[PDB]
Structures are given as C-alpha cells and as structure tokens.
Amino acid sequence: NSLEIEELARFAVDEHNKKENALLEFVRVVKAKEQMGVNPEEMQTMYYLTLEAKDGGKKKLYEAKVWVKWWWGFHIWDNFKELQEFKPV
Amino acid sequence: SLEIEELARFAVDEHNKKENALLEFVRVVKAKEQMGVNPEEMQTMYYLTLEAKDGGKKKLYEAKVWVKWWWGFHIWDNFKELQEFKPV
Amino acid sequence: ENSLEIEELARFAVDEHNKKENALLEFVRVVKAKEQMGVNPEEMQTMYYLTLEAKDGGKKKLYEAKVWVKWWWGFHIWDNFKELQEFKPV
Amino acid sequence: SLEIEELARFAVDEHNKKENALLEFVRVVKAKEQMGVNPEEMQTMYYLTLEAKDGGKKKLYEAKVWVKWWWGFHIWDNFKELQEFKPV
Amino acid sequence: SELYRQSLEIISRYLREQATGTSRKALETLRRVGDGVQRNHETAFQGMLRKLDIKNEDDVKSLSRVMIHVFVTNWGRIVTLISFGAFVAKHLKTINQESCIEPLAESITDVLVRTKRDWLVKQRGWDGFVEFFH
Amino acid sequence: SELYRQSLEIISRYLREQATGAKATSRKALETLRRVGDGVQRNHETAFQGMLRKLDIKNEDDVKSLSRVMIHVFSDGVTNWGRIVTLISFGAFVAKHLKTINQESCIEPLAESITDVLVRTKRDWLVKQRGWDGFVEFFHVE
Amino acid sequence: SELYRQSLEIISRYLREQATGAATSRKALETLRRVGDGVQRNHETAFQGMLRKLDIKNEDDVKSLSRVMIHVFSDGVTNWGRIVTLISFGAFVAKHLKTINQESCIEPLAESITDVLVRTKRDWLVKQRGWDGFVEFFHVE
Amino acid sequence: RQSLEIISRYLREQATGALETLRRVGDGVQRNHETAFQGMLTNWGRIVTLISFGAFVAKHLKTINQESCIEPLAESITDVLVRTKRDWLVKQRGWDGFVEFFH
C-alpha cells in the first residue's frame, strides 16, 4: 500500500506543477486515506493524501485528492490516474 | 428481458395484492425504461405493457414499476415498487 | 477485514472435510493464515494456507488445510468458486 | 493478427541481422501456431509463411519463431527467437 | 444523541408494528422497503437465523457482537440490517420471547449509530434515508 | 459438429444427474462441472430461488423462452467460463425444480435449448478457447 | 447514422488536435483530452514497440492497421477502457504520421478507426447510450 | 559463487561490445525495457530482467568512466538475488531451471 501511496503523492505534485505552472518538490506522505468504489462496477478509488513538499526552499503541507479509475485491458489491469484537488493545509 | 419478465410478474403479483385481485400474468408485449436523471442515482422507472388473464379472459395492462438498486453485502439488491397498474 | 474472511474459509475447510471424509470435527479457531495469490493478472486465483484448531470428540487438535479460490467477473459482481485441496493433521 | 504481423517483421529483421541480408517484409500469407505442451508453460511456436522483397523481387519464406511469455513487474514480457528462416 | 433518540424511536416503532401486524417519513419509508427486503431475503434471513441459536437475551446481546463486527455504507445495507431485525423480532414473538424485542431494537440501534455515525452526520441522518428511497 | 455433440453430452448428463441426485475432454469437462456447479448452485441458491419464483416453466415454449433470456446476459460485452458455468448451474437448479414438480420431460429439452443458444451465440469464442479444454483449464488448480 | 457522425467528429477532432499541439460530442472530447493523454503516457513504451514493427506507408496500411486494432476484442471482453486505449493508440500513430511528414494519412486513420469501431461494436455502443456511456465511465464518483 | 561468475561475465561482455541463455534473452529484454531502466537511477522472467538491468547499469557505468564499479555491481546484484530467492532459486533446480524456462 505505502509504496503505491508515495507514487500517487509524487504523481499529485507532478500534476499540480504541470496544471498550475509551479516547481514544488515532493518530500514525503504524512497521512493517506482511501474511498473505494461504492459498488463492484465503479472500479475506482479516491485517494486523500496529506504530503510535505518544498516551495522555494521552505517545506509546506498540501492536501491532494487523486482519482484512480481501473478496467480490464489487454491481458492486464489498466488504470487512469487524475489529480482532482491540490491546496495548502 | 429476464429482469423485464420478473418485473411484469411482480407488477401483477403486487397489483392484485394491493387491490385484492386474481390476475394471471401471461407475457410482456412491450417494455420501456425511463432511467434516472444521472446514473449515480441507480433508480430506473420501467413502463411495461403486459398481458394478464382476468376471469379466464386475456386483457392488457400498463404497469409503472420504480426500482432503486444498491450494493448489498455479497449481492446487487433492489427495492421494487408498483407506482401504477391500469387496463388499456 | 482479512481476519473474518480467513475465519469463514477455515469453517469452510472443516465443513468440506466433515462431508468429504464423513467426519464430525468442530472448528475452534484460525491459528496461522498465509495466501499465495495468482502469478499473473489472468489466473484470478488465490491459494489459502490455514492452520486451524478443531475438536475431535472433545479433544482439541490442529490441522493444515489448503483452500483454493477461483474468481471471475460475474453478472455485475465478482463471483468465485471455493474448493478444499488438502486437510491433514499437524 | 497484430502480434502475427509483428512476429513476421521480427523474423525478417532477425534473419537480416544473423545472415547480412537486406530482405524487406511485405505481408504474412499464412500463420499457424502450435501452442505449448500444457497451457501453464505459456510458450507458443509460430509457423509463418511471409512475402519479402529480396533486391526488388518478391520471394516467399518459411519463418519459425519460438515465443515464451512471463508476467513482468506491471506488464507481460516475452522472449522471441528465430529457429528457422528458409526460402520456399 | 438527538439522532440516537429518533433512531431508536424509528427502529423500535418499526420492529414493534412488524412483530404485531423526519421520524414519520423514515417510518413510512421503512414500511415500504422493509417487507420487500424480508420477502427477497426470506431464505437468506432463515439460513442466517438457523445457524444463530437465539433462545434468550444472552444470544440477542451476542448477536449484536457479530452485527457490530460484520459491519461500503449505504441506506440499502442499513434497511437490510433493520429488516433482519424485523425478521428476528417476528421469530422472537413465535417462540414466546416478546420481552427480547425492545432489547433487539436497542442492540440494532447501538450497532447502527456506533459504527456509521460519521456517515449519518454526513447524510443529514434520516432525511437522507427518505431521499435514497424517494 | 464436434463442439455441439460435446456441449450437448456434457450439459445433458450434468442436468440429468443434478435432477436425479447420483452419478477425455468430455469426461474431464463433466468432472470439472461436478466440482464447480455444485459450489456455484450453493452460492447462488438464494438468487436462483428468487428468479424461479418469478418465472413460468409450464411447457417446452417456456423452456425455449427461458434459454433465450438466459443467454441475453452476455450483452454487457463480457464472456468467460465463470459466467458460462453459472448459466449451466442455473440450468441444473431449474432441472431439480422440474423433477420436484413432476415435469421431468422438460429436463432434456432444457439441456438441449441451453446447448443450442450457447453454441449458436458463442461458437467463435468457444473455438478460440479450444472448446471444453479451455473450461477444464480455467478451473484447474495452479 | 448519428452514432457514426458523432464517433467520426470525436475521433477525428481528438486525433487532429493530438497531432497539432492543442453537446454530448463536446463532453466525449473533454473526457478524451483528460484520459487519452494519460493512457498514451502509461502505454508510451508498448506503443513505441508496436509502431517500430508495423508498416504505415500508405492508406492501405492505415486500413490494414484499423482491422488488426479492432481484432483485440475476440477474447470476449468490450469496455470503454479498451476503447479509449484503441483511440489513444490512434492519437499516438497520428503524432508519428505528423513526425514523418504523412499528415494526409491522419484523417483517413481517424475514418478507418471510426469505421471498424462502429461496424463491429454498434450493438454494444447503442446499449451503452453511445458516447454518454463513455462520459459516465470516466466521470468521477 | 557459480551465479556471480555468470552475472559478472554477462555484465562484463555487455558493458564492452547460462551465459548463452542470458546472451539470447538479455538484449531482447534491454531493448523493450530501455526507458523503464533509464529512470530506475517471482519468476525467471523477472530474474533475467534484474540481471538485464545489471547489464544496462554496467553499460551506463562504462559511458560515465566508472568501469571499476562493474565487478562490484555484479557481486551486489548477485548477493541481493541469492539472499532474497534462496528458497525460490532451489525450487527451479538453480540455473538448469533458468535454461529450461528459456529452452
């Protein structure tokens, strides 16, 4: 779980830096919450991350909501990951 | 058609319980689904035209059946309710 | 959680043994629980390795049970087949 | 058939490499697969008949390509090996 | 809590009238869905009840231990738990254990408000229940 | 065709013995079905009872009708051996019910109607799975 | 047919604007911009591997490629994830066709993918309420 | 020991310009993981991918004039492998299994 959580946190920082034209550097995950799909068909998870990142040589905390949609692809589980929200806390 | 045939049968069962009647379900002759505003609701309004026997005579009825789906514990579960049932 | 499903598989292992070997073991508790999941995404199977305690005529003994679980995409749900592979004294 | 077009292309590229030839792959004409002794192996032997241009003339060739699949860290990996490539 | 008062009021009231034969809307909603859920879970509830010796209040209090342990959260799963209550209430009546019915309602109410309080606050309590089955 | 003769032999013998009580590719497919279908019937017992109480199976027309609505379930665009063994397991559950209500003469037609709609609808998928060999492999333990 | 005209409008516009730089049809295209861009990133290596071992020299090769792309559904599983992967490969190929100065193959590629998708999956597409099904599949809970 | 020579010799010849099995499978695996291995700075398939990743790092170490780190890199990769899959490496009869996997 934790290793995958760290990669989603890095992913959230990368998407924030691209979508808002910023240079935050991921430091670490603080706490990780997951809402799984309400039914077996949805096949999606909402990840609620609190993470530490450097902005111009000062560490700050951010709350990131990262949506993951999965599906049966060509002989593998495939997914789409999307940043829903990224704000200071 | 499988869920539709069970919904028509349920409509006849539910009608004739609510109105103290003895209709025998024969078939669905036509089925229309008016699905909810957004699929997140998971509520479907089924409009059914069905054949049923009344006093051993073949008559036809329009049934509106509301179905709220939800994720049960190990199974897809639902609440079916007869909203309307009248001859045509 | 994990502990509940593992407990139900153990009860299953005892129920299946009692039928298959015409025995009347009473399940007490799960002792140890390991699982090897499918080598690839297409296998969609898990092998559960249980150690459990059951009563055999009012004396508490331990057993090793191997329970196989094959799953697939059913009608709007995940569905599965559970099968007892092995059930021996330890 | 996408996989079959990729194997035939590999067959020519690999043959071109091992024997300093400049064959240009054109098309597959017939593909046969003899699959593994048991399914768990995940090994397939491919018998391919293919068209290739050899110095601007279109000749035909029998390629035999062994493929062994295995589950990679987040993808399916494989190993392909040209066993035979001879004109026909 | 304010919710617990209405909860026990609704669950107790429903388990009572089922045993015999916002709060006003919740009860009507419960009357609508409950019997439908018992009818379709008839063989399910029977099987579950058959493997659960309930000959006394000791088993009723022991039933809540597994009810609070066995507990995705939706009004469907909630109405199914309350519906199973109505089914056990009817059973308790047939075996001359009517005095175990009010305690059963309390046990079920306890489990509901304990394990899923965050969700009910989030849902606007029984106003939300009425909306789910509206 | 070979696929048809095999499919009918397997599904007929299974439904017959399920409705009764007692007892290579074709042999292994029937041994597989006996392991799995009994488990699938137990897991779906409640849902199968639910469907049955809301369906008429009073004549061969109803049996043919039932086979058609049983195959319609694949329209969501997913076919696998689990979904197929569930369909046959429902078949076997309906066969027991047909024995219980003294309609044993509907059992072989039910077996035949299920085989028909399965082979007609899913022939291409079945051949590509190497027929009933794919079924045996799908429920073979790692 | 409207399913055809919708599918062509969406797939054409997405492949074109992927190769350049930048109502239900508007939302399907919005969904494709969100998802296709991430599916291409995730499959970059696999897509490069496929491309290196396929000929895309003329419209015959574009037609041939559309046929082998659709053949992937024969394991008996169709979903919007597999469909968006097929279209995302289309976009990947469109960018490559711009790179090797074959921009005139891009609209034919869009047309051939559209043709083979609607011809082969019309019944499944209709049952999903067409592109509304696609928008919903990628709509966040 | 027997592992270390195979890995070491395969990583050596790779960096420059079982052994026969790694020759066959290694360059194929490097080709189609080139990008995954560029950024990184149970079965035999994943195991040949780790040794393949060894050869890729070994090639890198040569380009950056750190060739003296290649022999240590073979020992490093050999150790983490045998220590971690000791109970698994004996289930496939050692490298006689590795060769069967790719026979």
Author numbering:
A (entry chain E): 3 to 91
B (entry chain H), D (entry chain G): 4 to 91
C (entry chain F): 2 to 91
E (entry chain D): 172 to 192, 205 to 254, 258 to 320
F (entry chain B): 172 to 194, 204 to 322
G (entry chain A): 172 to 193, 204 to 322
H (entry chain C): 176 to 192, 209 to 232, 259 to 320
Show me the paper's own sentences about this structure.
Pro‐apoptotic (or executioner) proteins such as BAK and BAX activate apoptosis through pore formation in the mitochondrial membrane; anti‐apoptotic proteins including BCL‐2, MCL‐1 and BCL‐xL, sequester pro‐apoptotic members to prevent cell death; and a group of regulatory proteins which bind to other BCL‐2 members (including BIM, BID, BAD, NOXA and PUMA), mediate initiation of apoptosis. In all cases binding between BCL‐2 family members occurs through the BH3 homology domain of one protein, which forms an α‐helix upon binding and docks into a complementary cleft on its partner. We have used phage display to isolate Affimer reagents (non‐antibody‐binding proteins based on a conserved scaffold) to identify ligands for MCL‐1, BCL‐xL, BCL‐2, BAK and BAX, then used multiple biophysical characterisation methods to probe the interactions. Co‐crystal structures reveal an unprecedented mode of molecular recognition; where a BH3 helix is normally bound, flexible loops from the Affimer dock into the BH3 binding cleft.
